[PDB]
Amino acid sequence: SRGEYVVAKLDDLINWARRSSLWPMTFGLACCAVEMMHMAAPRYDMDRFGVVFRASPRQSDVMIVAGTLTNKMAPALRKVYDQMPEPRYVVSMGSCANGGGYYHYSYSVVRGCDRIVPVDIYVPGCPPTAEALLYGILQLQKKIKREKRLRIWYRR
Amino acid sequence: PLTLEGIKDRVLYVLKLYDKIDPEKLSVNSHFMKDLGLDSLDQVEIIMAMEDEFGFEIPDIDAEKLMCPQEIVDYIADKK
Amino acid sequence: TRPTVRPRNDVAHKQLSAFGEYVAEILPKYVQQVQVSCFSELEICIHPDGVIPVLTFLRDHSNAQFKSLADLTAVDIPTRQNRFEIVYNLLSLRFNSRIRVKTYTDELTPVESSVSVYKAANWYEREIWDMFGVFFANHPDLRRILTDYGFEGHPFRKDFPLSGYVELRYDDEVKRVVAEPVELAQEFRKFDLNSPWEAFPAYRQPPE
Amino acid sequence: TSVKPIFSRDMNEAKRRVRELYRAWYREVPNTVHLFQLDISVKQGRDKVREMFKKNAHVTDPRVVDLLVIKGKMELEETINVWKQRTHVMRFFHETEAPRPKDFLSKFYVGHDP
Amino acid sequence: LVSDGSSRPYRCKIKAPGFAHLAGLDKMSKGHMLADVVAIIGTQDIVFGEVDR
Amino acid sequence: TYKYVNLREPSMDMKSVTDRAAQTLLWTELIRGLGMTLSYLFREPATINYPFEKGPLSPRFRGEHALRRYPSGEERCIACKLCEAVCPAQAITIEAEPRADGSRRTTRYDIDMTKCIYCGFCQEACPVDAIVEGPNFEFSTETHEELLYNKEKLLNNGDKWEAEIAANIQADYLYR
Amino acid sequence: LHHAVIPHGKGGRSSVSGIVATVFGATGFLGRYLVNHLGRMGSQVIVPYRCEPYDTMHLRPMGDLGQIIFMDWNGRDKDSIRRAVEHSNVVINLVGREWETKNFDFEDVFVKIPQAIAQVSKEAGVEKFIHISHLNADIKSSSKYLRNKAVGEKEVRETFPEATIIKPADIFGREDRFLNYFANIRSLGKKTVKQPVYIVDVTKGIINAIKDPDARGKTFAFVGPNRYLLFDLVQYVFAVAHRPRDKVERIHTTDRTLPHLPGLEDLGVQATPLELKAIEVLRRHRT
Ligand SMILES: NC(=O)C1=CN([C@@H]2O[C@H](COP(=O)(O)OP(=O)(O)OC[C@H]3O[C@@H](n4cnc5c(N)ncnc54)[C@H](OP(=O)(O)O)[C@@H]3O)[C@@H](O)[C@H]2O)C=CC1
Ligand code: SF4
Ligand code: SF4
Numbered sequence A: 001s002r003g004e005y006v007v008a009k010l011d012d013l014i015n016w017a018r019r020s021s022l023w024p025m026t027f028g029l030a031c032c033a034v035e036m037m038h039m040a041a042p043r044y045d046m047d048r049f050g051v052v053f054r055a056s057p058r059q060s061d062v063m064i065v066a067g068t069l070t071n072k073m074a075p076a077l078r079k080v081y082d083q084m085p086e087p088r089y090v091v092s093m094g095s096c097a098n099g100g101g102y103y104h105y106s107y108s109v110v111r112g113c114d115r116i117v118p119v120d121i122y123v124p125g126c127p128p129t130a131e132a133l134l135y136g137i138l139q140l141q142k143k144i145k146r147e148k149r150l151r152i153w154y155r156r
Numbered sequence B: 001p002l003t004l005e006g007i008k009d010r011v012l013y014v015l016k017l018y019d020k021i022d023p024e025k026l027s028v029n030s031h032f033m034k035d036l037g038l039d040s041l042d043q044v045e046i047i048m049a050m051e052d053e054f055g056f057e058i059p060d061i062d063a064e065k066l067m068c069p070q071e072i073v074d075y076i077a078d079k080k
Numbered sequence C: 001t002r003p004t005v006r007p008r009n010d011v012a013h014k015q016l017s018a019f020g021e022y023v024a025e026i027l028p029k030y031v032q033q034v035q036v037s038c039f040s041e042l043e044i045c046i047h048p049d050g051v052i053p054v055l056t057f058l059r060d061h062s063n064a065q066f067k068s069l070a071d072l073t074a075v076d077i078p079t080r081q082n083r084f085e086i087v088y089n090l091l092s093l094r095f096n097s098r099i100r101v102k103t104y105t106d107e108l109t110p111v112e113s114s115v116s117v118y119k120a121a122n123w124y125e126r127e128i129w130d131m132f133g134v135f136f137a138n139h140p141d142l143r144r145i146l147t148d149y150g151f152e153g154h155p156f157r158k159d160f161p162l163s164g165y166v167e168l169r170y171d172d173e174v175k176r177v178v179a180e181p182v183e184l185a186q187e188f189r190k191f192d193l194n195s196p197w198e199a200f201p202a203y204r205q206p207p208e
Numbered sequence D: 001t002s003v004k005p006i007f008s009r010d011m012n013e014a015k016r017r018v019r020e021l022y023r024a025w026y027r028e029v030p031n032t033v034h035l036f037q038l039d040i041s042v043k044q045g046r047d048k049v050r051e052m053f054k055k056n057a058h059v060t061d062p063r064v065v066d067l068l069v070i071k072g073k074m075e076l077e078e079t080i081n082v083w084k085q086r087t088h089v090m091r092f093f094h095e096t097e098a099p100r101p102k103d104f105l106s107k108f109y110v111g112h113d114p
Numbered sequence E: 001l002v003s004d005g006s007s008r009p010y011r012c013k014i015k016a017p018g019f020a021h022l023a024g025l026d027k028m029s030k031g032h033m034l035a036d037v038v039a040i041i042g043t044q045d046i047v048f049g050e051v052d053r
Numbered sequence F: 001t002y003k004y005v006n007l008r009e010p011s012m013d014m015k016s017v018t019d020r021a022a023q024t025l026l027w028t029e030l031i032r033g034l035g036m037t038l039s040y041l042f043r044e045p046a047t048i049n050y051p052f053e054k055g056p057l058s059p060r061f062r063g064e065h066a067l068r069r070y071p072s073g074e075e076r077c078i079a080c081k082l083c084e085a086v087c088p089a090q091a092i093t094i095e096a097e098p099r100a101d102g103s104r105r106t107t108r109y110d111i112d113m114t115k116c117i118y119c120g121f122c123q124e125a126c127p128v129d130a131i132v133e134g135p136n137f138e139f140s141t142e143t144h145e146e147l148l149y150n151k152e153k154l155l156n157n158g159d160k161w162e163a164e165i166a167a168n169i170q171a172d173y174l175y176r
Numbered sequence G: 001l002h003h004a005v006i007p008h009g010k011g012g013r014s015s016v017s018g019i020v021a022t023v024f025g026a027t028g029f030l031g032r033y034l035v036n037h038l039g040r041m042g043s044q045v046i047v048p049y050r051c052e053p054y055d056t057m058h059l060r061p062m063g064d065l066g067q068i069i070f071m072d073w074n075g076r077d078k079d080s081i082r083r084a085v086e087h088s089n090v091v092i093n094l095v096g097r098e099w100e101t102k103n104f105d106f107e108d109v110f111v112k113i114p115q116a117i118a119q120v121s122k123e124a125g126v127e128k129f130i131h132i133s134h135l136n137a138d139i140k141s142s143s144k145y146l147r148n149k150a151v152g153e154k155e156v157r158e159t160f161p162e163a164t165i166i167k168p169a170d171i172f173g174r175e176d177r178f179l180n181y182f183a184n185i186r187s188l189g190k191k192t193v194k195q196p197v198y199i200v201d202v203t204k205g206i207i208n209a210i211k212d213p214d215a216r217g218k219t220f221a222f223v224g225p226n227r228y229l230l231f232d233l234v235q236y237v238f239a240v241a242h243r244p245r246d247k248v249e250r251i252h253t254t255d256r257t258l259p260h261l262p263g264l265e266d267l268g269v270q271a272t273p274l275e276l277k278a279i280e281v282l283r284r285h286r287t
């Protein structure tokens, strides 16, 4: 099946192209923002993995929900999420974001962020030490490596 | 063309335009608070609806003290 | 006693005692209590009428400067007919001393809007209006700070429970975020930790 | 037993302020449905406004009526500006049922609420 | 701190310098433009974990 | 004692004012800033090659939430609920039953890794040191179900290694 | 029945309701809204999917913490589908594409798919199997789609006889095919009688029929209140949008009534007409 061979190789090529750079947007409310800045630090690079910190939600590949999400914040967070280009992926960073965390039993704190957006990679820690976030971004890249998108477009 | 019965007729059909009144039932001493079964809520709705229709502000103590459509016409002839 | 215990300085104790006795004897119109703690920080307990004269007297008069204003919190106490407590905190730049102006207040009758004499109390009054319900009379702008807009209930009260009455979630039916009545994921066990046997004999209040 | 009132002496000024606030909310709604781009006609919004006014229609303490005037005026300010977004104005409505009825029988099949 | 005689604090409260600094934003930016407003937000170290209490 | 900045005056000697005007017209200290930045250009970069060179750590890192057990023995825990009492997030959830051996034991021991703020209070509160903040911090969880650990996930997490945790505790049983 | 299957307390968001529902399809439109109403009800929904997990990722978090479950299936193996519906209370068949693929015609999807899954569900022993069809899908001509839906109705009524056959009219919502198709056109003008019905009334009818008892066997048909000309509807679409072969034959066939079998009045829900919800959904015109 030379057509299936071509579709498999071309899907491998375009999924490599997708997982190559993956420039995020740094949403970053509380101290998890400081830790995102500290994995933007000179010791732990991001440019080695093609990752560039960038304040442009009009072109951002993945979105890193980090910090304590509140009721006064969450419509603005999803309104940022909605003006995002449709191939989109979500990293929930931090105990506050991945299930409520320390301010769980509390008004004006959304219990997690599944109540707002879907989540692809949970990375726990408080703050998740930058090596753990970087391993989470590697597992996100390998999630992009396992997609079989064009194969499903073939055999659909 | 500042005719008093023209004011009467235009008040009558904007009360017709108000849909929560049954019937229209134009009178000189109608008293649509208690003789027609309405709240002061609908009273102030009708008063500032007349304000919406043809002009001046018609303040709130006067809205407390109109109570009757012919007296609204006489109040407009007093004020306008 | 001599190690492991913070000593107290009776010089400052006598000085703050004499100063509080001075202030209490020269403003008889609004003073009820001047209490001195063991650690020598003054507390002045005040009827809710002379807020503006006591603050204008305590900003000036050159026997006590106290130009610096800090926090205001009205900590909510039931089993009092007048519940809430306005706690002004005043700091002198020249003297290095701290006086806690506690005036009492109820649920509804306003205290007299200290923003006119201390400009640092603007967001303090707005914030304590949002969180408690202590109204301030003839204040410029009263809005909601540190809550959601559509939220109400004055949540730092004791009648408002720990978990709120709302719970947001996104849904795709109406394509937006909506609020439902609260559904916990765990009970929040409020443990019983009040142990008996009277650890402090010096604070035994006289019973009935 | 001396209490400083907020705004009013007797219920007359209380009624005057609350009907003034209702007049403002009546002339404030179509601006909101034109600005926030809501999804509900003018009649239904005005009916739930008059419903929320008719809900607390039996309170006679003038301090409490003045304080509800202050509450409604704060919400009228924050809705006549563009601060409160689409979520809060839809949150005033209840279209996300919760169809929980007030029978005895349907309250009996879904129990523990007498 | 406000402490009833117990093992629990009855009521804490926090006076925040970021809140006190941000209170005077009008009297810092009465006569400038928006880039200078970003400079004013810079020159007082806001973090808003603390400015919120 | 104080040391305040910016109290001078620009000089009236012609040499000083023409040096300042030369700085103004001639972009001088801008070029000196370029020289400083090129002096940091020619350093060697202090980046660690991440998946091959992992970062430095401590003997007492607070990680993985792995239980321990006795030397050639059974489970170390008791279900004495001290960790659940001290847990500030209240993420610990314990249900105890005793078994046929007579000694007291458990049934259910759940840690909400979502809620866990990673303090060390349950490490320092266990009287037998059963629950230990583990060594490594590599969780990276796709679903939301998998961040809710059972007793068996904790025991497999503590039987995939103890010699690491034993080495850490044998390193620093003297401070805590 | 075992415990933790009965309902508990209030409704939804970890308030455990009664049903355990396995939904086939559930990647597109109506399955998405039905999964949303079952997550509002607070049940456990087994959704299997054959496509890429990005789509079920975008419709993922509508259920609560780990309530809904994702699994895998195909249109070829009975054993994977039997593995999917091993343990379930109810199962709904919502599958079907409105064009032929390279690998599947309208043949064997409406033909092979409900026979196989209804066979293995009857071999599993579940209740209240609810199968969708379209309104007025008879044996007669002009549509392979409609005649294969007639064959599928005959299949689901033939085997597993206590299956709830359900059929709506042309249904519109936020991601409709025909109403957005009328929006995204260019043109021609003809006559046809037709009724639409807004999607939340249909799916509230489905959830009330699936949790209210003893309504099995009796096939249902959902009736909109308006029931007027297609050409007036298309002029209404151009008016609200401010701008003055298989699918076009399937919309120019007809829509006639079958009034013998009931609708929403034996179920107790408001049917919302076109005006309100159509002004709601018709955004995205000029400016
Ligand atoms: N006018 C209307 O819209 C009406 C529609 N209906 C019915 O409602 C249902 C949903 O409508 P619609 O908007 O079109 O949503 P879909 O067409 O997306 O729903 C069909 C489902 O079947 C899946 N599917 C597609 N091809 C195959 C295949 N070859 N084998 C197995 N599964 C397949 C789809 O994608 P995936 O594989 O990703 O799961 C999807 O989950 C349809 O079954 C339709 O017949 C009924 C009456 C009126
Ligand atoms: S998870 Fe921890 S580090 Fe992150 S925002 Fe919350 S408190 Fe800060
Ligand atoms: S403190 Fe230690 S022994 Fe006690 S319940 Fe917790 S892990 Fe078990």
Ligand code: SF4
Pocket: F083, F086, F087, F088, F089, F090, F091, F092, F111, F115, F116, F117, F118, F119, F120, F121, F122, F123
């Ligand atoms: S580290 Fe803290 S939050 Fe985590 S389980 Fe231990 S005591 Fe609880």
